[PDB]
Design brief:
The PDB classes it as protein fibril. The structure is a homododecamer. Chain A has no helices and two strands. Chain A is elongated and about 50 Å long. Chain A is mainly beta. Chain A has one domain: Amyloidogenic glycoprotein, amyloid-beta peptide (Amyloid A4, Irregular).
């Protein structure tokens, strides 16, 4: 059978989140 | 069974001269 | 030209530069 | 021979809602 | 008993006024 | 004997009768 | 400046029709 | 001198019927 | 002549049926 | 002795059936 | 007579912390 | 002397013990 399933997640541009001070948090349960 | 197509989710914000203090919280709780 | 259930979400923001610390609270659980 | 489809969602804002200090609470769980 | 169902939803907002503090509260969890 | 076809929807909104401070509160769960 | 008193507000929601996809997408910003 | 107060809000959703999958997306950005 | 500010926001939800996956996507910025 | 600045936000959800399906993505911005 | 600033935010869900399954993401974008 | 400022943020859930894991992510770039 034929099946397609994919996605894309991009979070807006803004005042870059450098280190010390600003911050970016990514949480992904466990790993493959 | 059922067939589906991929999707896309994109947010974009323009800021004059990146810098100090931005904060992003992304949680992807899921399994392949 | 075969098409199935598809979607797309776009959030675009263009404007000078509000104050210190923008903030993204986003959740992408997921399920089989 | 007939296929189904869904809609497209676009939230576009100029002026109101600039970078730095803005707050987006967006929930994108998943699909049943 | 299947038919094509698609559309486009675009929301454009823009208007000089005062102060900042803007807030987006959107729930977009899958579809029925 | 109702048929479904494509369509387009665009909405443009200016100044919110009252100070600034905007607030987008929408629930986009499935469709009727 | 005017004196403001408190009050009590309660809401109860049930679903008839059939089955129930519950969905609460709300924005509770604030008012001057 | 002077004194101020706010109101109280209570929300309750529950009703015998079927399925589940609940989704709550909320924005509560404090306002001065 | 002292500043006074209190509040009370309550969101309660429950429903049998089947499966689970509940989803909370919430943004609670802050205050100045 | 005297009232001051306070708040109160309560979220309560009950879900059985399958293994715990829950996905919480919450952003608590904050202020300097 | 010193000003006091406090808040109370609480999320109650009927589900402990099982194995690969429940998922919680919390981000506090701010500086002491 | 120095004004008082602190808060209370709690994420809690109750049900069946179960085993080792569940998945929680806390992001807070800051230093005393």
């Amino acid at each position: 059978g034929y099946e397609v399933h994919h996605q894309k997640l991009v979070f807006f541009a803004e005042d870059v989140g450098s280190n010390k001070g600003a911050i970016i948090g990514l949480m992904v349960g466990g790993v493959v």
